[PDB]
Paper text:
Nitrogenases catalyze a key step in the global nitrogen cycle by reducing molecular nitrogen (dinitrogen, N2) to ammonia (NH3). Some diazotrophs encode ‘back-up’ or alternative nitrogenase genes: vnfHDGK for the vanadium (V) nitrogenase or anfHDGK for the iron (Fe) nitrogenase, expressed upon the depletion of Mo. Upon complex formation, low-potential electrons are transferred from the [Fe4S4] cluster of the reductase component via an [Fe8S7] relay (P-cluster) to the active site cofactor of the catalytic component. The active site cofactor is expected to follow the general composition of [MFe7S9C-(R)-homocitrate], where M is Mo, V or Fe, depending on the nitrogenase isoform.
To examine if the αIII domain flexibility is observed or even amplified in the resting state of the catalytic component, we tried to solve the cryo-EM structure of Anf(DGK)2. Using identical conditions as for the AlF3-trapped complex, particle orientation had a strong bias for top views on AnfD. To circumvent the preferred orientation problem, we collected another data set of the catalytic component with CHAPSO detergent added right before plunge freezing of the grids. The use of detergent mitigated the preferred orientation problem, and we obtained a cryo-EM map with a global resolution of 2.49 Å. However, the map is missing electron density for AnfG, suggesting that it was solubilized from the complex after the addition of CHAPSO. In support of this hypothesis, loss of AnfG after the addition of detergent leads to a destabilization of the αIII domain accompanied by the loss of the FeFeco. Thus, the G subunit might stabilize the active site cofactor through interaction with the αIII domain.
Numbering used by the authors:
A (entry chain C), C (entry chain A): 54 to 107, 113 to 142, 146 to 166, 181 to 334, 339 to 356, 398 to 519
B (entry chain D), D (entry chain B): 5 to 68, 77 to 106, 112 to 460
């Protein structure tokens, strides 16, 4: 809850009523980024309960507000130690400051809906309004999908919760549709939003070219704007398909071990040619990845990505390039070589990943003037984020 | 000395004591510790160690429960036929000693006949001290569990404290040149494991049960860190009459000299001329940069307490201006520390904050504290990034620079590495800000 | 010539008609800085004569102008190899470009005066105009003295040549007075300026407090503005004398070996208490300094300074602090200690330079509430340069 | 391959041949070379070596002129009673061989009876070639002057090329692990001298006359650099039939493997498992950063030619994208180099500029070449400072960073140091520009 769902909120002080060690362990371990200068990644607040405490919470709440005068939203989490009256303390703090709001936190969904949803009203409501639910903005995924929605002329009322604001998530109850990215984290939010306000839910997939195109087409079909989705799909296909197919030709038949397992498995086999099952690559977390590194198998981080975002068409191409770079590394073949063998295949000079990968393709593929390698900057979110902030400015002037 | 006047924490500098206990345990050969708490605690401590070293280490969990401990021990001993030391570490929500007594009589003799298995407890409450206190109590608990009187030995005990594999490599080089054999606690050089062609080799600690047993028969104990190993040295002195020398942490030239003098007094071994030439090489490198670039540089330092104090002393010797020293836990021994008293006496422009968090540094910078350099670990990286103060990565964890564990901060090689790294960080900042960057020609 | 006098010109392409190895050897070895982004320090131009040439000059001259379109001034130096018609080539280059001027290089003084001096005419001439001659702006010395002159209401027509422009040095014949910083380098310039235009000469000293104050007083006496010099001297004394005396108390009786020998020697003994004559410090160049480093003696660079500028009152205090830092380093005493000696004086903890220096002073000096250590930024020229560029802007508006 | 289309030079990459000859000479024990030219030539070469190493070296001058050479030799032999090798180096405006013949019969036998003094000439015109060719011709001249046939030896000749003391330390470590004795040309580890308490120790070279004499009796010669030592190896092969292996420069894992294979073939010594373990440590460090940060990084490289080519090959192995390779002199052997041919064949986006200056890089950046990293020495630092491209300091001279001479760029330790240094330079640039700097947590 605190470590996955609550934290991606960008303009909130998340203070844990408990010891420092729990607040420390989850700090700077995630990649939920935001356009609020990553405030949710840079600062972490604990009440610092000591043995004597087993007054303090009220004072720590005031201290955090004082240190960060531009933050007016607070979420107080109760840890294991403090289970042995936070609500009243929060009311007193709100009364004394007078311009701040405090939230006392599956469970985080019930808590937010029964406490915060419905208390704020949007000033402007577009023709087509959605709630993006279950997205937590790993390396810029939320901003990728917002760009896709903006180019469709769709206003995203709120994202739950990645790069999301407190007030938007309180305004969540006035959307025309809910689009659900992750269900295992935010099913109840959508079910109860439908139960209380009759807001339809549309499950979508943001990974791949066909799953994402179909998701965009369903979203457009709901709003009767199918032509905009078709134009987006055609443009993104023309831009990124030759680059993706360049890697798909060199990744046909490679094996991946998965330790984002069904959001990925079918699209990986269909669009990258990989066989999901010694594997050629393992998709896992950082510590298991470092474990399997000792076995000569590369890994891509399945939780935080490597060179993300992996969402969108360009993100899919970045994912393919990451796979291809890990699999076809010349250092991989150098590490598997035993130089102490009496007849060891010791060479000099260099090799490239392209040299290794082109041994697997045919001459027609190898000399294609259509397929080319990925042509994108190291940070692909800077241009998407600048586009997103320009659409917000343009939409604000029209209003 | 400043004590934090805020009750809450913003951006803690250390984690809880069980994490320090687990880090102490992973330095022992054939030791896999079971943490009697949530699986998430072990997951986050393993992630933190993986962040520091980029290596996976084996730590087990009980998934809270006295009988769950028994099942966890059974499962661990079944699934790891090489583990010999099985420490049980308690946590927030957590009589494991009597349960272990029953286990060594019922489960081990029956299910694992002929298997050498040692069970011990490390009680680590998470709301009393910090990971420094946890490391200190874990080292004491291991030494207490294993130390046994035997035939006298010519070795000394070197309780290094919570240090990097490069620090251990430097300390062992110094001892080898001095011709001194030691029971080094702990041998963490194997934390850095190779990417082998055919046979996989995983990260592990190299301190054996024999070393911990033989700690009782040493000529003496040198505990480099007063807050990370003084408890074990005091236990050894109190039970087996092993004389103990506490400190100094050999950061810089002078403290390394004092460390080598302590070794020479313990062992009777003279300081040789090779150490004189290595010390002179470090001093020549330091003389290249000292009064040209290092003098009058304003420094903020936070690290493990002993390392932070030693870094402050080394910076003062280099003619720098330490402005802020952050000691991130509530230890009551800092005020009575003779090194801290000396810092108060002869470095009056240095503010020492005990029980500090990163907000102490960040708010002091906000209110107008001008700094040229920071010495600290990677959890404070965003102060450096956002306020444009260069930082040299020292301590635990340093996860945003590559391979910092392989370099020493102790010894003469550590002094040279520290001084040249501080100079180079300053040079890169001078070039980034175009601040007299033309001056880096004929120094 | 090409290495000491000509190069400090900030807006000129200094192309050497000769091999690359001579142009390389003196590049990035000096500390003549300028407000033109150190163009004279960043770029060096050679004709690159090879064995075949033992046409190319014209092409390399055109190439340099093409690469640096904002530079319209060129100085062509003949090297040893090219002794075996540069003037004609320079004329044709000027004719073809049409907006550039080329100068064909004791000797460089005669060459500049007989060709370039007298051509350009000053746009504005103030009441009091000087030529600052013999100053080459090491670490910002020229900017220090310009600040002093600006606060006196004196316009500096040109500096020869440190942080000097080509056109200003061509305008050298319309100054009311010439002030001499170095005579061994620029005696002839001012002798012939007096011979041709009757411009009076005033030898000055920029180092120390008494020599600099007397220089300022002489300059003011020439222009009848003595009160401005007195105000400057009083302000700078009040600001920097307690800081200088802090170091002079701790440097009384120390010995300095000189290997800037007479522009320094008397003011060093008088104002810093040092005895110029094992020495405690040696003033020399970089290579001899590194030689004597092996003998346990620190050095301050006598040619390029250490933490310069050493000119001005604040520069004098910076010089004193550099001396005191080198002499009283705890590393100096650590390096002189033989740790392999049986009864070696091995200690732990730390020492400071202040602890070592205070062992030499009395209690009345040690507990003075008047004397304090130097309080100045690492780069002291940034504020002086910003003041200089503000006075130039203000003088533009009035004109 | 690009050849510079400008006749003039802007910002040369190398100095003249006499400087390279003097640098080769200062690596010999009891050698003080007299440069038959201006005082300024020797002053600037000594200043350049002092910039690189921060150490003073003894090089003599004749000040200009055969009688001047004779007087200079007399004065040098009077004022230095330890010098044995006295090479005379010619320069721009300069029968030193005939005079030297006369001197060895008239001056040395009479004025210095019983003193072992060797006089040789190194002719180094400054309008042909560069400091690389000057170093090559100086090494050839020393080997030719001293090599003498004797009883056969089990040693090999390792002509390292113009390398750093850290490179020599790494190469000697590799040879010692492989159990190979060598005549190392040159032993420059003593360039780094200590700041001793009482006695003064000055920087010098450790290559003796005995090593240069014994080069004729070796099993074989391995010249790491084709442009900095192939002439001496070819002379040895042509005169004394000493088999010569030219290259590869052991930059990176693969080239170090090829170097160790060449050593094993020359000597018959097997490659041991300790080198396997050290290579694996380097490979594990490289695997931590390779496809996360190093892949697809756009790199410009300039250095000494062999080092620059090897760095390009290592970067290509690391999945980086070398864009520009600058070879700063007019050598005609670059086009026929098989390494350069391989770079043309399989690195298609790499432009190789021969006879280049720093304006090649700077103008290519001006016209739109986007780079993430530069590998080059300190004379090109202002391109990095002004165009905001991070640079890793490699080669000669590196005077704007502290102690770069003490780290290797050769061997497996050199490969690890290079990869981690490029990673850390990129990390510091990412933090300075705030370019995905949050990503440096859980890599
Ligand atoms: S719960 Fe668990 S990580 Fe440490 S020991 Fe508790 S503070 Fe949390
Ligand atoms: S280019 Fe080199 S330094 Fe110049 S006069 Fe010639 S030999 Fe000497």
């Amino acid at each position: 809850a605190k470590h996955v769902i609550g934290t991606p909120m960008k303009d909130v002080i998340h203070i844990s009523h408990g010891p420092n060690g729990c607040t420390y362990d989850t700090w700077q371990t995630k990649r939920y980024i935001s356009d609020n200068d990553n405030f949710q990644l840079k600062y972490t607040f604990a009440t610092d309960v000591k043995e004597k405490h087993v007054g303090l919470l009220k004072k720590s709440m005031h201290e955090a507000f004082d240190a960060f005068p531009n933050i007016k939203r607070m979420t107080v989490y109760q840890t294991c130690t403090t289970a042995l009256d936070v609500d009243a303390i929060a009311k007193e703090v709100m009364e004394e400051r007078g311009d701040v709001d405090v939230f006392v936190c599956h469970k985080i969904n019930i808590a937010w809906l029964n406490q915060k949803v419905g208390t704020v009203e949007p000033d402007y409501l577009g023709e087509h309004v959605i709630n993006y639910v279950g997205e937590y903005n790993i390396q810029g995924d939320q901003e990728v999908m917002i760009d896709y929605f903006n180019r469709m002329g769709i206003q995203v009322l709120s994202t739950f919760t990645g790069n999301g604001s407190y007030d938007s998530l309180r305004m969540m109850h006035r959307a025309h549709l809910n689009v659900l990215e992750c269900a295992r984290s935010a099913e109840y939010i959508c079910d109860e939003l439908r139960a209380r306000y009759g807001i339809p839910r549309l499950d979508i997939d943001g990974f791949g070219f066909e799953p994402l195109a179909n998701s965009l087409r369903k979203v457009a079909l709901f709003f009767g704007i199918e032509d905009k989705a078709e134009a987006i799909i055609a443009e993104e296909y023309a831009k990124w398909k030759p680059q993706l197919d360049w890697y798909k030709e060199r990744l046909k038949g490679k094996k991946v071990c998965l330790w984002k397992l069904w959001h990925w498995a079918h699209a990986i086999e269909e669009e990258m040619g990989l066989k999901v099952v010694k594997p050629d690559i393992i998709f896992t977390g950082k510590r298991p990845g470092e474990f399997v590194k000792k076995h000569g198998v590369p890994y891509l981080n399945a939780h935080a990505y490597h060179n993300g975002p992996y969402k969108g068409f360009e993100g899919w191409v970045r994912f393919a390039r990451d796979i291809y770079n890990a699999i076809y590394s010349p250092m991989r073949q150098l590490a598997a070589l035993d130089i102490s063998a009496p007849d060891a295949a010791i060479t000099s000079g260099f090799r490239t990943a392209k040299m290794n990968a082109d041994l697997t393709v045919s001459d027609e593929v190898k000399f294609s003037e259509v397929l080319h390698e990925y042509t994108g900057k190291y940070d692909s979110i800077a241009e998407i984020r600048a586009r997103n902030q320009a659409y917000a400015a343009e939409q604000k002037a029209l209003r | 000395v400043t004590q934090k006047a805020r009750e809450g924490t913003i951006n803690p500098i250390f984690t809880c004591q069980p994490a320090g206990a687990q880090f102490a345990s992973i330095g022992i050969k054939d030791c896999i510790g079971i943490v009697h708490g949530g699986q998430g605690c072990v997951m986050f401590v393993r992630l933190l160690i993986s962040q520091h070293m980029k290596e996976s280490f084996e730590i087990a969990s009980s998934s809270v429960a006295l009988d769950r401990v028994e099942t966890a021990v059974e499962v661990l001993l079944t699934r790891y036929p090489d583990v010999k030391v099985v420490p049980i570490i308690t946590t927030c929500s957590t009589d494991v000693d009597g349960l272990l007594s029953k286990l060594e009589d019922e489960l081990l003799p029956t299910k694992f006949p002929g298997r050498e298995v040692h069970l011990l407890t490390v009680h680590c409450p998470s709301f009393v001290g910090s990971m420094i206190t946890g490391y200190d109590k874990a080292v004491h608990d291991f030494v207490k569990k294993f130390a046994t009187k035997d035939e006298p030995s010519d070795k000394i005990n070197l309780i290094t404290g919570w240090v990097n594999p490069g620090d251990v490599k430097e300390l062992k080089h110094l001892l080898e040149v001095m011709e001194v054999k030691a029971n080094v606690l702990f041998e963490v050089e194997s934390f850095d494991s190779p990417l082998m062609p055919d046979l996989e080799h995983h990260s592990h600690g190299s301190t054996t049960i024999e070393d911990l047993r033989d700690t009782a028969n040493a000529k003496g104990t040198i505990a480099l860190n007063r807050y990370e190993g003084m408890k074990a040295a005091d236990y050894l002195k109190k039970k087996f009459k092993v004389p103990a020398v506490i400190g100094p942490t050999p950061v810089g030239i002078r403290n390394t000299d004092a460390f080598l003098k302590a070794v020479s007094e313990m062992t009777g071994q003279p300081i040789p001329a090779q150490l004189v030439k290595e010390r002179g090489l470090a001093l020549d490198a330091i003389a290249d940069i000292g009064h040209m670039f290092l003098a009058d540089k304003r420094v903020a330092i936070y690290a493990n307490p002993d390392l932070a104090i030693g870094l402050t002393e080394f910076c003062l010797d280099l003619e720098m201006k330490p402005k802020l020293l952050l000691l991130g836990d509530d230890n009551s021994g800092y005020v009575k520390d003779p090194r801290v008293l000396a810092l108060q006496e002869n470095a009056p422009d240095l503010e020492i904050v005990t029980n500090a968090d990163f907000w102490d540094l960040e708010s002091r910078i906000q209110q107008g504290l001008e700094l040229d350099l920071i010495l600290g670990h990677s959890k404070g990286r965003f102060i450096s990034i956002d306020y444009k103060v260069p930082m040299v990565r020292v301590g635990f964890p340093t996860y945003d620079r590559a391979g910092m564990y392989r370099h020493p901060v102790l010894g003469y090689g550590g002094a040279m590495f520290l001084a040249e790294t501080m100079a180079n960080t300053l040079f890169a900042d001078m070039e980034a800000k175009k601040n007299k960057e033309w001056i880096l020609n004929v120094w």
